[PDB]
Structure formats: structure tokens, C-alpha cells
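Hi Y.,

Following your request, here is the sequence exactly as I used it, all 151 residues.
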Amino acid sequence: ATQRFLIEKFSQEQIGENIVCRVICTTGQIPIRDLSADISQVLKEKRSIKKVWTFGRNPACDYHLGNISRLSNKHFQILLGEDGNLLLNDISTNGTWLNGQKVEKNSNQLLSQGDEITVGVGVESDILSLVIFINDKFKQCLEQNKVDRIR
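Below is the corresponding structure, written out as C-alpha cells. Let me know if you'd prefer a different format.
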């Protein structure tokens, strides 16, 4: 098996190519997505932030939620730039929640392992939650920060 085997890998894509963080909806509303950033860009970018994701009801947003009034076009945004760490920025009209605790809007917070962000607060049954999964593999590359394209 040569050609057929190649097809098998087609469906099963190895995750962890350049993934920064992963977003998983535990409330069962939005499909799981994976946030990623290129190493070269991270090493080259000597600024505070490098790549940031925007989440919300906006089809432009790096993350497409769905159709919840409690959520804004761009409910929340995630930025990556720290020394291997990640930053979560809330950008909702009503606010972004962390494990039941509401954080300061447009504020940067240190990412957490398997953390979770709650949004659409106002109604007990109208709140949506999201889980953040950090890629340990990515941290390894950033922690070492080695170059292999210098000439």
C-alpha cells in the first residue's frame, strides 16, 4: 500500500505543526479550532505581540462563534508574544469570563493550562464557555528558540 496509505494520512492530520493554543467548546456550540503561529515570525518579531486571534460572531474574526446576542462580533481576542507564554484579551461588549471570574475588558492576562473562557454573561442559560488547550510542543521550541536557516 502506497497511494492508498497516503490517503489515510489525508484525514488524519498530525496536529502540532506550529500550534500556539487550542480552543475547545465544552458547551457544545462551536467546533474545535487550533490557534497557531510561525516560529520564524515569533523569533523575528522583537515586539510585545506577534500574532493575535479574534473571536466572536464576526465571520472575519479568527474564530466563528455562531449567532448569540449575548456575544459581540469580536467577543474576545488572544495574543501571543511573551517568552513562550500566551496572552488572552477580552474584547466583548458585555465582557469575557475566566472560570466564572470576569476579567477586565481589553486587558491582557497570562494563559492557563486547559484554561476556560466564559462569554455571553447576563442570563444563566445564555452563557457560552470555551476551553483553551496549550500546546506543550510549541513551548519547547520557544523555550529553546533555535535557528536553522542562517546563512
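The helical segments are 3-11, 39-44, 136-144.

Thanks again,
Q.
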